[PDB]
Each structure stands twice: as structure tokens, then as C-alpha cells.
């Protein structure tokens, strides 16, 4: 699972109101992070610089196979994280076109204390105008090979941070394809290394 | 309730949990269109025109 | 009425606005401060909004439609004469800070669209809750970081050899700012900014207008 020492993601989902485009609920395979640097902004704040500072056990790559097969409306994304510590977290998610940042969404969340842990919830947070328009134009293309061509160089960098210490708790890099199936989405999680 | 909040803010000082903490924002610096053109070229330009 | 004498609608008032550069050193590029609506200042001069449609993105999300729907007493034009004369950034934080007031308690959305030749180049969307303090509901966007586009723009602009060259660049540079009630979707105020360099050695100026017809 997607977990460092201080934070783990339990759930992540992008949806349309419900339709799931993309959903998530050791011995993960690895990916050399030097091979994907070009897929995310490379200067300061870059994935390379991020990796070199923050703990290397916090870095992950998720491959999604989206389910774009729906005719449904609210566009939202919901994720939830768990920690042993109580802290204030900032979730920063940058959408990237050919490695250049196109939208960045910054969210700051508190923990409710529930069962053994501190849980954090981003509940039904709305997609930006850009993303709706993107998914819309993507969804309505005449062929799946065209859709994968668009998705080829579409990526999202998600870096979650302890707002006070500025320490990075987990960093997830997403890459994309359309699902081969008529229905359903799939995913595959990787640990980012070296 | 901001009027209640004031009392608390004033009472706790450096122990006051901001009810909706910063930062928050959405910054958009790009056109979806420009992406499709780059991925699909003439094929995308043909579709736009219908 | 008190309305029409400051950047203030029925539901929202701009108290303070500034873009700045920090390093401890600070430089103001652009500054505005107002009071709550009152009878102390004369009516603002007016500007025909049709003279300005062409300087902002139109079509759907556009200024014309925005004007045609939400209350027309919520619409303002600010002319800035920015102060570009500072030698810092040679470290430096580029920020913008604003502050607003409401008679009501609400949740406001501030959307800032930067525009080059009337087409949008960046958009920043901010959500602010109201802090309550003595009689007032106050909203603050404090030291909000400028985007890479804007830093680069100001840098390249700062270093031009001539102010007439600076004014030519600013000629087609505009910022549309629309503040909105997140529930009612009512537009609380909408300000259109146009720009020039200050003629002065130091300091910035402004001139506020009500947009009409």
C-alpha cells in the first residue's frame, strides 16, 4: 500500500454524479525515479529535488486505467489519509501537461481522531474548470487509441506535506491510460526508488 | 459561528486552532485545448470543427 | 446613497489591496485602501463598460455576461500606475495581499484572471471565510504567492530601458477580478484593472471608476 512512516492513503477516487473514473481503496514493484523526472516540473520544487530532501520511503507512482464510459452533474475527487501523529497537512496536487504544470490545487486539512489513528479527509472536493473540460473532451473522443495518446503525457504530482515542519509525508506520481474494458477501472502501485 | 469563534480566538491565543486553515487555492495556468493539439495534432483540429 | 463612492457593493467592500516584493526589505508595486461605505467621499467618476469588453476574455465566462447578470453597482475599474523602481531580487518573495468587509457573514470566492491581449493567461481561485472582530466581518488574503508568470512578467518589465516601452507592454495587460458568494453564486464585486508605469520616481497611484451601461 501507499504508505510512508507518517502517512498512508486509504482511499482515493475521482467521480461524476455516481460514476468512478478512477478509484483506490508489501513488495510493491519499483520504478527508477530518474526515468520519470521529465514527466513532472524539473526545476526548483521538482520531483528530483523533492526526492533528495524528503524521506525516500514516501515516494510512489500509481498507474491508473480510467473508466471513461459514462453518460452522466457534479465532478468531484475524494481521498482519505491516516496518521499515527496529529498534524496539520497540506495536500498539493499539480496537473502536468508534458511535464509543465497546468493546474495546482492546494488543500489544507486537520485530523479528526477516530479509532486508533488520526484520519484526514478531503471529502467531495470539486474538480477545477480545466479538469472538467479535459475529462469532457477526453471522454467524447471517437477512439480509445486517441484517448491514450492524449493521456500519454498527462500526469499528476501529488505531494502531501506537514505544514509546520515542511516535511513531506507522501508523494504520489500518477500516470494514465484508458481501461481496455467496457466498464471498470484498474490501478497498479509502485514504489519510486533511487 | 464567527462571533463565537472570536471569543475563543481571543481566549486561547497561540493555542487557537484556525477552523479553516491556510493555504488553499486553485491556480490554472494552461489551456486544455493546447494539450489536445499537442497530443493529436491535425486529428484534434478536425474534431473541434464539428 | 453611500453606494458609488468607493469599491463597495451592497454586500462587500474592498478595504485594502497590494502587490509587493519582500526580502528585511519591501517594495509596493501597487496599493489601494478604502473605508466602509459612508458619506465622506464624492461619487466615483464613471466609465462606459463597453469601452473595455475587448480587453478581457468574452464568450461565456466573460465580462459582458458577468455585468449583464450580477448587480451593476458591484462593477469597478481601477487604473494603476505601478511603481517598478526597486533593486531587490538581485531572497525575494513576490506576494499579493487583500482585505475585504461584509455586513453579512458569508463565504467568498476570489477569482483573479490575468489577461494578455484579452485572453486569459493564468487564473487564481481563493476561498476566504470571515473572521469576526468587534463589529465587523473581515476577509483576508494575506501574502498570497504570485505565480511564475507574474514574477517573470514584472522582472522582464522592471528591466526595460524606457517607461514608454513599459507602457506599451502594459497596454494589453489586464486583470479581471470577480468576487463571488460561494453559495448564492451572486457576484459580490467585480474589478477590472488596467495598468501603466508611475511617472513618479517613487510611489504608485491609482484612480477608481464605476463601470456603467
Swiss-Prot record, chain A:
Domain of life per record: Eukaryota
Gene Ontology molecular function, alphabetical: DNA binding; DNA-binding transcription activator activity, RNA polymerase II-specific; DNA-binding transcription factor activity; RNA polymerase II cis-regulatory region sequence-specific DNA binding; sequence-specific DNA binding
Subcellular location: Nucleus
Keyword terms, alphabetized: Activator, DNA-binding, Nucleus, Transcription, Transcription regulation
S-S bonds: none
Oligomeric form and interacting partners: Interacts with WWTR1/TAZ. Interacts with YAP1.
Listed name of the protein: Transcriptional enhancer factor TEF-3
Full-sequence range covered: 211 to 426 of 427
Curated annotation (Swiss-Prot), chain B:
Domain of life, source organism: Eukaryota
Whole-protein coverage range: 203 to 252 of 287
Subunit: Interacts with TEFs. Interacts with IRF2BP2.
Role this protein plays: May act as a specific coactivator for the mammalian TEFs.
Family recorded in the similarity comment: Belongs to the vestigial family.
Signal peptide region: none
Location of this chain's protein in the cell: Nucleus
Descriptive protein name: Transcription cofactor vestigial-like protein 4
Disulfides per UniProt: none
Amino acid at each position: 500500500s501507499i504508505a510512508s512512516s507518517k502517512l498512508w492513503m486509504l482511499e482515493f477516487s475521482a467521480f461524476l454524479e455516481k460514476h468512478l473514473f478512477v478509484h483506490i481503496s508489501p513488495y510493491l514493484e519499483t520504478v527508477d525515479i530518474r526515468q520519470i523526472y521529465d514527466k513532472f516540473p524539473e526545476k526548483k520544487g521538482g520531483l528530483k529535488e523533492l526526492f533528495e530532501r524528503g524521506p525516500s520511503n514516501a515516494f510512489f507512482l500509481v498507474k491508473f486505467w480510467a473508466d471513461l464510459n459514462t453518460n452522466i452533474a457534479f465532478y468531484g475527487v475524494s481521498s482519505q489519509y491516516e496518521s499515527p501523529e496529529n498534524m496539520i497537512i497540506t495536500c498539493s496536487t499539480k496537473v502536468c501537461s508534458f511535464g509543465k504544470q497546468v493546474v495546482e490545487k492546494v488543500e489544507t486539512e486537520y485530523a479528526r481522531y477516530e479509532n486508533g489513528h488520526y484520519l484526514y479527509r478531503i471529502h467531495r472536493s470539486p474538480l477545477c474548470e480545466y479538469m472538467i473540460n479535459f475529462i469532457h473532451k477526453l471522454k467524447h473522443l471517437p477512439e480509445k487509441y486517441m484517448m491514450n495518446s492524449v493521456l500519454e503525457n498527462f500526469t499528476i504530482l501529488q505531494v502531501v506535506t506537514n505544514r509546520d515542519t515542511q516535511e513531506t509525508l507522501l508523494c504520489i506520481a500518477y500516470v494514465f491510460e484508458v481501461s481496455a474494458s467496457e466498464h471498470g477501472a484498474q490501478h497498479h502501485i509502485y514504489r519510486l526508488v533511487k | 459561528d464567527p462571533v463565537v469563534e472570536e471569543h475563543f480566538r481571543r481566549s486561547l491565543g497561540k493555542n487557537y486552532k484556525e477552523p479553516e486553515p491556510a493555504p488553499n487555492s486553485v491556480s490554472i495556468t494552461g489551456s486544455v485545448d493546447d494539450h489536445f493539439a499537442k497530443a493529436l495534432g491535425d486529428t484534434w483540429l478536425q474534431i473541434k470543427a464539428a
